[model samples]
Target: PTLQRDVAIVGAGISGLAAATALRKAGLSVAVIEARDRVGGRTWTDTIDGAVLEIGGQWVSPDQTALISLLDELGLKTFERYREGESVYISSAGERTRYTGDSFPTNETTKKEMDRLIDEMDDLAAQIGAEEPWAHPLARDLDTVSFKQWLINQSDDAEARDNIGLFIAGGMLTKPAHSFSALQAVLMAASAGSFSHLVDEDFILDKRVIGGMQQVSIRMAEALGDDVFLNAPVRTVKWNESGATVLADGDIRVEASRVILAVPPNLYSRISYDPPLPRRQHQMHQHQSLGLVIKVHAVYETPFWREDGLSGTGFGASEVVQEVYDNTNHEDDRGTLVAFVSDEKADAMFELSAEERKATILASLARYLGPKAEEPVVYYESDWGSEEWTRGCYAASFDLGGLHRYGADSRTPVGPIHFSCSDIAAEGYQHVDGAVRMGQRTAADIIAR
Candidate 1:
């Protein structure tokens, strides 16, 4: 079979869909090919026991401009994280405490240390300017030192050390604060616009679509009309100065003036490219790593921990879990908590049978809520690591000195092929907003040229 188009896009995830939508709106003959049978890629919502549940990317903040704007243009909404009361925290010391403070500062000394650390972070942000932190001269230099190492070298306080460690270990899916370059972390925070944005930002408040994010993708596909193709996977891309040929299932050949590679770098290996990507581009793809995190959801017949006045959301799990959230504010009265167990824990968690996984999670929940979390009416779990299409949740925080080599220009076009993925966006990388921004920007560029 043979196909023709002015522009061809690979991947039907949010990034590819957004790009196709933009290009189609611009009157370009755009066609989208996806490897998976369904859209939404890593951001999908499914029904569990009659209640809508998000299988990927469960939250988005109001300030996430690109995604928020698209949702509003489509008449969509999001749900907020229930924070009317206190949040539960299990510290490295293994003691669970109810936390109500605006920020972490366990005691007077810790408060003073945190204040100092905040000032240092603010100073760094001010110096770099929030908008172009990664492009600044300090970006490469900052990555040379780990956040924890940088903090400890600057100050010797338990509070500052623990605070910095948690932010790094939990914030970016990296092993530790020292695992990241100080500058890359600062640039990430700055690009987000403010410290508050990084700390308190979430898309989980009063903010759920009437249906789900899948509806958003479905609506987008309908708007795109025939230009969008689902379940069509591209096997190879052969390019030249005039145009390119996209080889996929049935060997459908596409003639395109431009090509948009919107999928992750990892998947780039699947498609054979003529002359191949440049050494740097190929190296970037080879080096990029995704966090193989697992999400486990259990819905109980009742809000068991409400009797204890606990939030039901807990962070810092023992050996088996990382964090859990209370998801009962929706139409269902049943208590539903989603636990996020990431990195190495994902392997152990995923290998366990559903019964064992649920039992372990429930036991940990019971430890905090006392017996209320014993059993549940519904249980579900998804492993991003196991998904061939997604492979991982988001990019892992890189080693110090690695960001500069792959951050910005990795997004630039290579000959007829242009790149756009949340993995390489200036802001919100690994976020829906970043995906939309990258997709929209790539579409605009293709249209302009």
Candidate 2:
């Protein structure tokens, strides 16, 4: 069947759905076409073995006003993530220590170095800003150097460097420190307001929607009603200045005055443009790619660690699972822990046999929460890298020097084709919050035109 509308949106991700919703509210017709039979994009909340689990992006901080207001609009209530007890910090020496404060368990000099490096990053992030890091004078120099090398030049303390690197490397970008530029890392800090915020687990991972993050998009899709089409993946777009046609699965075609490509930047190449995108766009997209991560969810009989006075928060800069947090659902009887094995660690973990991988992963969890963690009633890995539609977790990032070079044109439209995704947002980049902001921005842009 064929469809006609004022705007045709590819991918019913939050970004695209928000844009479509906004356009419809403004009296414009919109069609939201998505590949998956679902609407939530990377924010997936599913049931595994009869247990509710968040298999994708699931956190909301106080600073994310865009998402905060949207939640209120949708009448969606939120509950803070559990953070009452001591946090665990595993040192390079393999010493796991329990700490009560926000500061990590590190020694005197290394702690000072951590502060110094964080200060430097905060200052750099402020100067560069998330909106336009490439315009800054330091962009050329810092963007040229890998974040790992930049850390080496900043301090001589080994512990300080490795731990600080974790916040942006395995922590945010989900890539090795050597893969992305220092400027790229600075943008990560800037996007979150400060480098210190990234380190503050309580602040960054403060709250979660009572139900699930996916509900945000699901609600928006419901509002869009029949306009939102599932399992309608767009494979080609024939566009020009006057209008555009999106060709999707089976014989479905959508003709509209404008088009919003809301899929992740990494999948941009999957579509065939009738008139190829500009040379710069092709090169620009090549640099913007997703990072690998295995989002691990483990469910136990109870929040076993909390009984032992541990907050279920653990950070190990050197371990296979670098970060783990208390992900117990709101007032849910069972306990759940969300852990991430990022970048190279994800690479290594995927190589193991299914039986061996489960054993090793639970073993690592045991190191933090004790023997109880190794025997969760349910264990699952949300390995996005292996998924056909979405290939990675968290989101995409610019390669060394790519952010400064092509970022300015990232949101620039090609004729009637506009782009929107959390990966390209400024404030809440790479999160559900950012997806909302980018969608609103994309809708506003098209509406004004």
Candidate 3:
């Protein structure tokens, strides 16, 4: 079956769906081909043993205006995340302290060090600008140095270095500090408003949709109707100056004037191009890679941490699970604790057997909350790394020094193919807001032509 449309979008994530919606609004036909059987690429709200688990992206901060506007337009309701009482912070030396507000519960010297680094990053993020970080003169110098090395150069305080590094490394990128450059880390903070915003979990991970984050994609996909095809994995793209032919699994063939490869940069190489991408495109794609993360979920009978004057918001820089939060559903009695095991820590967990892994991960949770955490009504791990269509959790980032070299031309369209995704966005970055913003921009760009 030959399906003809003005635009053929590959990947039915929020970015692709948002693009399709915008194109449709402009009176253009679109065919969205998704590799997965369902919509929402990185955002999946699934059921696990009678418990509803948001296995992917779920948070919406105040700074994410693009997503906020779309939510209001879609008529989706949102509620404040459970942030009451005290937030637990464990130091590198394994000292746990209950505190409130942004700063970690550490000593005065280390606390001061952390503040200094954040202020410095805020300055850099502001100076560089998220849109074209590589444009800055200091980009080369910063990109040459690893985030870990940058932190070391700034301060001698080990505790402050780990906690500050955790914000961008384990928390955002889901990769080690040494793996990415200082410039890339600055972009992460710049994209989210400031480094201070990233440090303040209340500011970055603030709100949640009443239903789930995946609802945004679902509503858009619904509007697209038959134009959106699921289980249609596009393996090869035959594109040129006039138009392009998308060859997906089965008879899901779409011939269009333009193609929006609205997926992450890491998966761009998965598809085969007829004439093949240019040298720069091939080189740039290699520099971009997704970070790994395991979102661990544990459901309990009641809100256990709430009874203990804890908000379930805990951070441990040296622990197996670096971050944990209260993820209880709206109007539900069951209390759920969502923890993240990111980057190398995730690698360490994968090495252990299933029985040992469960026991160990739960024990890590128990270290923060109590013995009750060890025994949950339902337990599951959102292992996006193991997924075929989506190999990573959060998003992709340029390798050390790669940002300055290839970021400027990363958005350039090859003939008729336009690339748009949260990973490549300036404002929202890895969040859904960036995805929405990028999608709209891509649609607008095509409509102009």
TM-score of each predicted structure versus truth: 0.91, 0.99, 0.99
Question: Which segments of candidate 2 are over 4 A away from where they belong?
Answer: none
Every candidate's lDDT: 0.71, 0.90, 0.92
Worst 10-residue lDDT window, candidate 2: 102-111
Task: For candidate 2, write residues 1-449 as lDDT tens digits.
Answer: 89899999999888998888889889999999999999998989899999898888888988889999999998899999899888889999999999988678788877888999999999998899999888889899999999999999999988888899788899889999999999999999999989989989888999999889999999999998998889887999999989999999978899999999998999998999999999988999998889998889999999999889999999999889888899999999889999989999999998999989889988898888789998889999997887778899889998888988898999899999999999999999898878889999999999998
Predicted candidate 3 versus true structure: per-residue lDDT over 1-449, tens digit per residue: 78999999999999999999999999999999999989999998999988998999999999999899999999998988799999888889898889997688787888888889989999999999899999899999999999999998999999899998788999999899998999999999999999999988788989999899999999999988999889889998998899999999987779999999999999998899998999999999998988998899999999899999999999998999999999999988999999999899999999999788889999989888889999999999998888888888799988888988898987899999999999999999988999999999999999999
Candidate 3 error regions (>4 Å): none
Q: Candidate 1's residue-wise lDDT over 1-449, tens digit each?
A: 57789889998878888999898889888888888777788788888777667887656666678888898888777656555556676665677778765564256776687677767776787688634456877766676777767887767886556655444455454344556667766766665654445555242232555566677777787777766666678889999877788887856678898999888877777899997878877777776667666677778888776667776666553435656667763666777877766666666766788778778877876665567677777777766777877777655434556676666656778889988777767666667777889899999998888
Model 1 Cα shift for residue 3 (angstroms):
1.9
What is the Cα-based lDDT of residue 36 in candidate 2? 93
**What TM-score does candidate 1 get on C-alpha atoms?**
0.91
Clashing pairs in 3: none
Instruction: Write the number of the candidate with greater TM-score, choosing between 1 and 3.
Output: 3
Is 1 or 3 the stronger prediction by lDDT? 3
Model 3 TM: 0.99
